Amino acid sequence: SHHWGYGKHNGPEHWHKDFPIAKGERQSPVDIDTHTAKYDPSLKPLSVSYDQATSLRILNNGHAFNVEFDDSQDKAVLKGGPLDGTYRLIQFHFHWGSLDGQGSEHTVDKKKYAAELHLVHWNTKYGDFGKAVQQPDGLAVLGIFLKVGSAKPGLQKVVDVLDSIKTKGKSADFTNFDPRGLLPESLDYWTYPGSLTTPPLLECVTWIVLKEPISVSSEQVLKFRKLNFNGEGEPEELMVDNWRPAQPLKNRQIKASFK
Ligand SMILES: [S]
Ligand SMILES: [Zn+2]
């Protein structure tokens, strides 16, 4: 440690020293054992309403890049599934690897994907993001896996702006991006109660992990690997492998929306 990161000296195995909740009872990510996940017919279909989404900016925060959305009103929301209430989209970001064989946070039957997209939403009953993180049902994160295959056209606008936010603290205007181009065809999912996967690791997330991965091209993922963890004019450390390994499931059941 000193500030946390993904290196040898401040990586996930060290987080517990500054954030004791790292060894909590509802930590994320986890491995999804498909044969043990319970089909639950009481789960409703997810409802994604992203047609009025307003993207604002893209920022390199030193551990990933976030695309942020205007969440001052009910423009891009998620509801249904295992959720009660309306969850507003605030930001999305990815986790990726130094090689195609790793990168995702969640695994499926121990399979790791090249990357993992997180769409972050907060429960509107709490009024703001900072209050939602303090509640057991404060956030809803939709996780989508990426496999390397064909290019994903709806991801290119993202890939193209990375050069302008190469180093930590850099940001760029990023209006009119439509997150609908990042969804797979099927919205079948697994769900379980967990946490944020970076410090502060708060246990306030209802995870909704989609069964169907989207494919990206190798060239697309390559550009992610060109970003830097460091700030401008500091020694160069490529932003790769910014994923936390799977944590113990403990007393939790993974439910499936399908069989
Ligand atoms: S995350
Ligand atoms: Zn994440």
Side-chain angles (χ1 to χ4, degrees):
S1 186
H2 159 57
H3 176 95
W4 65 269
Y6 299 88
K8 181 96 238 228
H9 292 107
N10 59 0
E13 59 277 20
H14 290 270
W15 299 347
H16 69 101
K17 282 180 282 169
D18 277 312
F19 309 92
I21 201 169
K23 298 202 172 281
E25 291 290 293
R26 62 166 264 206
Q27 282 298 292
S28 287
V30 301
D31 171 61
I32 301 164
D33 172 359
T34 69
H35 302 285
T36 265
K38 220 305 189 73
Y39 170 60
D40 177 354
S42 79
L43 285 169
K44 308 173 198 55
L46 273 179
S47 164
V48 177
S49 298
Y50 287 170
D51 62 288
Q52 310 265 69
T54 299
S55 60
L56 291 178
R57 183 166 88 134
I58 178 163
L59 152 81
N60 170 342
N61 64 15
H63 49 274
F65 59 93
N66 282 180
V67 169
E68 293 169 345
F69 288 78
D70 175 358
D71 64 342
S72 66
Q73 296 182 84
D74 278 357
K75 280 150 109 123
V77 303
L78 202 222
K79 55 190 98 85
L83 306 172
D84 292 309
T86 299
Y87 289 71
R88 296 187 190 150
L89 172 75
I90 173 168
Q91 58 102 333
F92 71 76
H93 60 267
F94 298 85
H95 300 268
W96 61 87
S98 46
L99 311 156
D100 299 342
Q102 71 200 36
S104 69
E105 287 203 311
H106 295 87
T107 60
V108 177
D109 294 335
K110 305 282 226 302
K111 189 200 186 315
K112 298 182 171 62
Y113 283 95
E116 189 176 321
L117 171 55
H118 294 161
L119 300 129
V120 182
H121 314 67
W122 56 273
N123 195 327
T124 61
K125 88 166 131 148
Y126 307 119
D128 67 63
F129 179 88
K131 296 310 223 75
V133 303
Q134 282 302 128
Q135 304 292 154
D137 58 347
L139 292 198
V141 184
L142 203 61
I144 300 173
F145 293 120
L146 273 71
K147 43 162 284 271
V148 172
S150 310
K152 185 83 164 176
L155 183 60
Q156 199 65 27
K157 270 157 67 172
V158 178
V159 167
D160 280 341
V161 75
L162 303 179
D163 266 328
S164 69
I165 60 149
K166 192 173 193 106
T167 63
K168 177 187 178 52
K170 289 219 180 267
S171 72
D173 292 320
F174 197 65
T175 55
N176 308 102
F177 173 84
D178 181 353
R180 291 186 297 179
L182 305 169
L183 309 180
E185 173 200 311
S186 169
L187 298 182
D188 284 345
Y189 60 91
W190 290 285
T191 185
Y192 75 98
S195 72
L196 288 184
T197 76
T198 52
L201 309 163
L202 300 171
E203 294 179 335
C204 60
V205 184
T206 297
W207 271 99
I208 296 163
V209 176
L210 307 185
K211 173 191 9 96
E212 185 192 320
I214 58 167
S215 72
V216 301
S217 67
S218 171
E219 294 77 20
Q220 289 181 314
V221 188
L222 276 171
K223 287 192 206 183
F224 286 11
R225 297 188 191 133
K226 302 213 174 174
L227 285 172
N228 290 175
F229 280 134
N230 58 284
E232 191 165 9
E234 296 164 4
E236 193 176 23
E237 337 159 58
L238 301 181
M239 185 177 280
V240 292
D241 291 319
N242 54 355
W243 49 273
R244 183 187 195 197
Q247 300 303 304
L249 192 69
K250 285 169 147 137
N251 227 131
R252 292 169 294 180
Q253 129 155 125
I254 294 169
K255 306 206 157 248
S257 72
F258 62 88
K259 54 216 221 156

